[PDB]
Amino acid sequence: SGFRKMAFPSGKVEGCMVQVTCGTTTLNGLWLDDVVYCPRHVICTSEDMLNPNYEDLLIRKSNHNFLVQAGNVQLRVIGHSMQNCVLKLKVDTANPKTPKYKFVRIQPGQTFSVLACYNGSPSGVYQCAMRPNFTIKGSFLNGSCGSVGFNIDYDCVSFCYMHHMELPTGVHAGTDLEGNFYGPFVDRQTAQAAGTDTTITVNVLAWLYAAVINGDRWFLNRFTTTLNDFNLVAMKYNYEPLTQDHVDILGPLSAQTGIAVLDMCASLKELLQNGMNGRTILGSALLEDEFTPFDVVRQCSGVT
Amino acid sequence: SGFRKMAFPSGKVEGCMVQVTCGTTTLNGLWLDDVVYCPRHVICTSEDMLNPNYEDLLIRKSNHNFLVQAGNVQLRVIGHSMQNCVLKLKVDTANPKTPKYKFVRIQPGQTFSVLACYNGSPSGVYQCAMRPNFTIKGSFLNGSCGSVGFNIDYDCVSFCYMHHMELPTGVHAGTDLEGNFYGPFVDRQTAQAAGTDTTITVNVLAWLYAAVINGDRWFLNRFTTTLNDFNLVAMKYNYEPLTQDHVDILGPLSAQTGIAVLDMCASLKELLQNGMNGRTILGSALLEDEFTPFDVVRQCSGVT
Ligand SMILES: CS(=O)(=O)NCCc1ccccc1
Ligand SMILES: CS(=O)(=O)NCCc1ccccc1
Ligand SMILES: [Cl-]
Ligand SMILES: [Cl-]
Numbered sequence: 001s002g003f004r005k006m007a008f009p010s011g012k013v014e015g016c017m018v019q020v021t022c023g024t025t026t027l028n029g030l031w032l033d034d035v036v037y038c039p040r041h042v043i044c045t046s047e048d049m050l051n052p053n054y055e056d057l058l059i060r061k062s063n064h065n066f067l068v069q070a071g072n073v074q075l076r077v078i079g080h081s082m083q084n085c086v087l088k089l090k091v092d093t094a095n096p097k098t099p100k101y102k103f104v105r106i107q108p109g110q111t112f113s114v115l116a117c118y119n120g121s122p123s124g125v126y127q128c129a130m131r132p133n134f135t136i137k138g139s140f141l142n143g144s145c146g147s148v149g150f151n152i153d154y155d156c157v158s159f160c161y162m163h164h165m166e167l168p169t170g171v172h173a174g175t176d177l178e179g180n181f182y183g184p185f186v187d188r189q190t191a192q193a194a195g196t197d198t199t200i201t202v203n204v205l206a207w208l209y210a211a212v213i214n215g216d217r218w219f220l221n222r223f224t225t226t227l228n229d230f231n232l233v234a235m236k237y238n239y240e241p242l243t244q245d246h247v248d249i250l251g252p253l254s255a256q257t258g259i260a261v262l263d264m265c266a267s268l269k270e271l272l273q274n275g276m277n278g279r280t281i282l283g284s285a286l287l288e289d290e291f292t293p294f295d296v297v298r299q300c301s302g303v304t
Numbered sequence: 305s306g307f308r309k310m311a312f313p314s315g316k317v318e319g320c321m322v323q324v325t326c327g328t329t330t331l332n333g334l335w336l337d338d339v340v341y342c343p344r345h346v347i348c349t350s351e352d353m354l355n356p357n358y359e360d361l362l363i364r365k366s367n368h369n370f371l372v373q374a375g376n377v378q379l380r381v382i383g384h385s386m387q388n389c390v391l392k393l394k395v396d397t398a399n400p401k402t403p404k405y406k407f408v409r410i411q412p413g414q415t416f417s418v419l420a421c422y423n424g425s426p427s428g429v430y431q432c433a434m435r436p437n438f439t440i441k442g443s444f445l446n447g448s449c450g451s452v453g454f455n456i457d458y459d460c461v462s463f464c465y466m467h468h469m470e471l472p473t474g475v476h477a478g479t480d481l482e483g484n485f486y487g488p489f490v491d492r493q494t495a496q497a498a499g500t501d502t503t504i505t506v507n508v509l510a511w512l513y514a515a516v517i518n519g520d521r522w523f524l525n526r527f528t529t530t531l532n533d534f535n536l537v538a539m540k541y542n543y544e545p546l547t548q549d550h551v552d553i554l555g556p557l558s559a560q561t562g563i564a565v566l567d568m569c570a571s572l573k574e575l576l577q578n579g580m581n582g583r584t585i586l587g588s589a590l591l592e593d594e595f596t597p598f599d600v601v602r603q604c605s606g607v608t
Binding site (some may be wrong): 008118122137143214276284304 | 305307313316422425428429443470474476518519579580582589602603605
């Protein structure tokens with residue numbers, strides 16, 4: 001029993017982290033097979049970051065300008081290319097610790113683990129969601145750029161995020177491993193406001209299911225609702241609209257607890273309209289939205 | 305910027321997890337050098353768990369009865385001994401992935417990471433505190449026994465916890481790696497109630513410091529207090545008493561933010577007496593107590 005915000009075991013990713021230095025700028029890179037991936041702004045001075053033309057800056061950079069250190073050992077750079085907002089540095093040595101991996105672009109609402117790194121060395125691991133405004137709420141200090149987000153299916157690491165940026169509001173923006181920003185963000189020291197950080201409704205519902213399973217029952221009410229009625233309340237409370245695709249995904253949690261999805265929606269509706277009245281659910285005083293239905297099934301079944 | 309509940313990178317510990325089977329019971333063991341550590345109740349049937357005499361049960365167990373599997377490879381058991389509530393199985397092969405390690409008995413209020421494991425395979429990592437009643441609030445299903453809690457100082461893993469038990473209230477009890485239970489708990493299927501789960505005051509204060517650093521300011525008030533006045537309010541709210549040792553430990557956070565510890569105490573006092581009024585601090589609607597002062601310094605400075 002018990003339900004915790006849980007990250008993937010990070011070992012497989014720890015084995016991929018390197019330090020990348022280009023001039024005076026040091027950040028992290030991801031070493032998979034014989035390629036190091038890092039944010040392209042490794043080539044920039046803080047002065048370059050105002051209006052950087054990256055192709056122009058990269059003309060002044062050769063293979064030997066990129067310093068790649070894995071542990072306390074230098075890697076030989078034998079090729080470099082820009083892909084979107086990432087540099088792919090080819091090195092003359094395959095990472096002997098390359099796990100099975102995929103690059104995946106996630107959707108808003110999807111959760112992933114972050115291995116926070118400084119100088120190619122892991123400091124910590126935490127669980128995040130891609131927010132509906134394509135920001136993440138991370139923990140990232142200077143030097144943390146190139147720290148990655150990932151999911152693991154048994155032995156295959158799916159890399160979904162690389163850290164590039166803090167917005168002036170202190171939320172985080174980054175790319176997939178093809179170097180494509182989540183959301184409208186660009187890697188420039190310029191005005192970039194996030195949109196509405198709405199609540200991930202399907203995730204709240206999953207976590208209410210996790211609560212019931214784990215014995216937190218008090219919020220269960222006498223009501224049901226419809227998707228249309230629930231969505232009117234969702235809109236008012238800056239909750240993402242619930243679709244039948246979300247209902248479908250919650251099916252296994254519904255089946256276990258014998259609580260129909262629409263009934264759990266009616267209990268969420270009452271929680272939105274009446275608040276917690278100083279009560280807690282799985283040790284939270286607010287409705288948690290960084291557990292997917294898949295996360296809840298995984299944790300409550302014990303997949304490894 | 306940003307402040308997250310962060311676990312230690314788990315790789316070094318993942319390299320130590322094995323499966324231990326004794327008869328029909330499978331749980332996890334920790335393989336350090338040429339010793340496997342596991343909960344002694346590996347020898348028990350659920351029928352044995354009612355009033356187990358462990359020395360008597362262990363007479364019916366030889367080296368070959370303990371099945372130790374590291375990955376998909378069997379280890380040869382060449383010796384076994386009971387230490388308190390743990391079995392130490394000597395194996396004929398040092399764990400080639402043994403990190404630098406210490407066994408440490410932590411105090412209530414101290415935080416640690418848990419690598420949740422099933423059949424010797426890691427499922428997840430999360431951050432816990434030893435509660436003042438010597439329980440932890442974990443995420444542990446059947447098969448998770450022998451999952452360990454740890455801190456890391458650079459390259460040295462300090463092992464502080466091994467998982468043994470769920471209490472009927474669904475909170476968790478276990479041992480240090482010398483097999484000594486935290487708190488009064490025993491490894492028996494019997495009546496065991498936890499005491500008062502008080503709030504770890506020094507940890508709340510640290511997290512209020514983390515909040516200020518990260519730009520959450522709204523709760524800062526116009527008041528100060530004394531340890532004696534604060535402690536009267538603490539008592540009423542089932543907060544641990546604050547000592548001058550706690551004040552001393554918060555010194556570095558006080559110095560950074562130029563907020564005297566007693567001033568932060570006065571702001572905590574007002575939060576206890578007036579509530580959050582529907583507001584949040586570092587995305588929490590309640591006062592978080594699972595960050596130590598050391599955790600806050602580590603995360604806010606970026607130790608690796
Ligand atoms: C090259 S640096 O040392 O000055 N750091 C870059 C951080 C940054 C990334 C994207 C946009 C704004 C800033
Ligand atoms: C030996 S088992 O399969 O039945 N599981 C033991 C779990 C347990 C541990 C301590 C006290 C009560 C129960
Ligand atoms: Cl950086
Ligand atoms: Cl178990």
